[PDB]
């Protein structure tokens, strides 16, 4: 019986929705009086600490790019008065069209050659963001120094530390255990 009591108590406690991250709110599609289920999206929280850049290079340029090479990124909101430093994190094993859900071209039409593009992950320095912050989807001019070529195209090191962890949705079972003890003492005679 105690197990069912704990499950019911957890169900009641979850009647409050808690934030798992510290950021800012966007796209608040929730109003009072709405009827909701776990699959219904309520809003979004966008952390403004760890941002990267996705640079789409042609197949012609992907070669000669290794991991760790220096980069320089300049944005448009701040113009040329501010620069950014970064590094190559790695190249993706797909061109975007790999996972597309629709035909790349129409069946009825003919076939025309199109040069493909392959994304590259670039990581920014965090001391510049705090003073010159960015926002998601802003355009930027990227330039990668490819002078030095060790030959490290694919990463091969695994890490024992998780990247993103949140434990704000964990509920400690002290009050439930106290309530159960009190009820047992009450009904025990």
């Amino acid at each position: 019986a105690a197990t069912e009591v704990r499950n019911a108590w957890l169900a009641l406690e979850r009647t409050r929705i808690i934030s798992p991250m510290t950021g800012y709110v966007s796209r608040r599609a929730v109003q009072p009086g709405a009827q909701i289920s776990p699959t219904t999206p309520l809003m979004a929280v966008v952390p403004a600490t760890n941002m990267w850049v996705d640079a789409n290079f042609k197949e012609t340029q992907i070669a000669n790019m290794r991991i760790g090479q220096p980069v320089t990124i300049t944005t448009d909101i701040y113009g040329d008065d501010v620069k950014y430093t970064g590094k190559v994190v790695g190249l993706d094993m797909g061109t975007g069209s790999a996972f597309s859900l629709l035909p790349a071209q129409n069946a009825t039409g003919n076939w025309i050659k199109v040069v493909q593009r392959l994304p590259v992950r670039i990581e920014l320095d965090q001391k510049q963001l705090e003073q010159y912050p960015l926002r998601i989807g802003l355009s930027t001019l990227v330039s990668v120094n490819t002078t030095n070529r060790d030959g490290q195209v694919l990463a091969n090191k695994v890490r024992s530390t998780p990247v993103a962890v949140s434990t704000a949705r964990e509920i400690s079972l002290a009050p439930v255990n106290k309530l159960i003890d009190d009820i047992v003492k009450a009904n025990a005679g």
Binding site: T15, R16, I17, Y24, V25, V30, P41, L134, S143
Partner: protein, 60 residues
Amino acid sequence: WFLVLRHFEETDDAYVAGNQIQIMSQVSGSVTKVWADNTDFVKEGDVLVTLDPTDARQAF
């Protein structure tokens, strides 16, 4: 001078990227409060929405 420009690679198809989480409830019910709106700073562990506890108390 020219091969120096070849020692570099450029692209204007870049866009800043980040993380985003779609807040979702673990339970069904009705809403009675909404604790934040667009462009509001919320910290981890803060309440964002509240539901009517009438149906859960009966099961409890």
